[PDB]
Amino acid sequence: TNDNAPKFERPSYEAELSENSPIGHSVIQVKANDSDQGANAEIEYTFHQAPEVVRRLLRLDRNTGLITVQGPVDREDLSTLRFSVLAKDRGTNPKSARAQVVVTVKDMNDNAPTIEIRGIGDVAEETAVALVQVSDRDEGENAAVTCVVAGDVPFQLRQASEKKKYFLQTTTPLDDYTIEIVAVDSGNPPLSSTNSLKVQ
Ligand SMILES: [Ca+2]
Ligand SMILES: [Ca+2]
Ligand SMILES: [Ca+2]
Ligand SMILES: [Ca+2]
């Protein structure tokens, strides 16, 4: 008869996993142990109680305790996957044991900075003429954006001090102009977008 509980090799498991990992990719391996012999020591791993998301993104091998990728991890959609692995042997009285598991989703530079523009209408030098707002959905460096007017044109950007906002203003006056704004991450590889604009 079934004398022992299964026992995880660790009460709790931490893990890092970069978003957009390929399907099939190994995430982590869990192991439990039964001092017993026979079926009374034959462990199945299962997480039927795990959140829909976890079950949607991850596959847990019933026999080995290998968690591998089966869906699209988006750090931008969900940044941490926390759940619990159940291990029970095959006694007819099947003694169980439970280990909790945390996967922190690592950021990838998968998001090009976005730049939204609205106008304000001799004209004075240093005069604000548009509102430019810039935002990158990524994290840290991958969202450290650099924004500049492409060309040689008598306009430049100036920050509304410390979603980043900027005044597109005047560098000298006169008395009509197309103006291209350029945005670039400080992540590797960096991504980039532009937005044209006709002064009004
Ligand atoms: Ca047992
Ligand atoms: Ca993403
Ligand atoms: Ca990202
Ligand atoms: Ca980015």
Residue numbers in the entry: 216 to 336, 350 to 390, 396 to 408, 414 to 438
Sentences reproduced from the published study:
PCDH1 has seven EC repeats (labeled EC1 to EC7 from N to C-terminus), a single pass transmembrane domain and a cytoplasmic domain with the three conserved motifs (CM1–CM3) typical of the δ1 subgroup. PCDH1 may bind bronchial epithelial cells and epithelial cells of the airway mucosa together by mediating homophilic adhesion and helping in forming the epithelial barrier. Here we use bead aggregation assays to show that repeats EC1 to EC4 form the minimal adhesive unit for human (Homo sapiens [hs]) PCDH1, despite its longer extracellular domain with seven EC repeats.
The first two, PCDH1 EC3-4bc at 3.05 Å and PCDH1 EC1-4bc at 2.85 Å, were obtained using bacterially produced protein. The PCDH1 EC3-4bc structure (T216 to Q438) had one molecule in the asymmetric unit, had poor density for three loops in EC4 that were not modeled, and it was used as an initial model for phasing the PCDH1 EC1-4bc structure by molecular replacement. The RMSD for the shared Cα atoms among the chains of PCDH1 EC1-4bc and PCDH1 EC3-4bc was also low (~1.5 Å). Crystal contacts in the PCDH1 EC3-4bc structure are not expected to reveal a physiologically relevant interface as their areas are small and repeat EC1, required for trans binding, is absent. Nevertheless, some of these contacts could represent low-affinity transient intermediates for both trans and cis (from the same cell) interactions.
